[PDB]
Structure 1
Amino acid sequence: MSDQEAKPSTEDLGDKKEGEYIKLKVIGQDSSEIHFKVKMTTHLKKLKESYCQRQGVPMNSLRFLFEGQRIADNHTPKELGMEEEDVIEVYQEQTGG
Structure 2
Amino acid sequence: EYIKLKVIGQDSSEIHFKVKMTTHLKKLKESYCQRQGVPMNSLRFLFEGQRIADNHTPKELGMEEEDVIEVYQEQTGG
Q: TM-score range by the shorter chain?
A: 0.7 to 0.9
Greater fraction helix: 2
TM-score normalised by L of structure 1? 0.71
The structure whose RCO (Cα within 8 Å, separation 6+) is larger is 2
Shift of 1:41: 0.9
Query: Which of 46, 55, 68 is the equivalent residue of 1:65?
Result: 46
Cα displacement (A) at 1:78: 1.0
- C-alpha change, 1:83 and 1:24, in structure 2 (3 Å) is same
How far does the alpha carbon of each residue in 1:48-75 deviate from its partner, in whole angstroms, 9 at most, with x for none?
1111112111111111111111101100
The Cα shift of 1:46 comes to 0.7
- What secondary structure does 1:78 align onto? helix
Describe the shift of the 1:32–1:96 C-alpha distance in structure 2 as closer, same or farther (beyond 3 A).
Answer: farther
The count of residues paired between Structure 1 and Structure 2 equals 78
Instruction: Report the aligned-residue RMSD.
Output: 1.9
Offset at residue 93 of structure 1 (A): 0.8
1:24–1:36 Cα contact (<8 Å) kept: yes
Unaligned runs of 5+ in 2: none
For 2:64 and 2:35, the matched residues in 1 are separated by 21
TM-score by length of 2: 0.86
Cα distance, 1:29 vs. partner? 3.4
The structure that has the greater radius of gyration is 1
Q: CA deviation at 1:95?
A: 6.7
Q: Report the structure, 1 or 2, having the larger strand content.
A: 2
Q: Taking every aligned residue pair, what percent have the same amino acid on both sides?
A: 100
Q: Deviating runs (4+, > 6 A) in structure 1? A: none
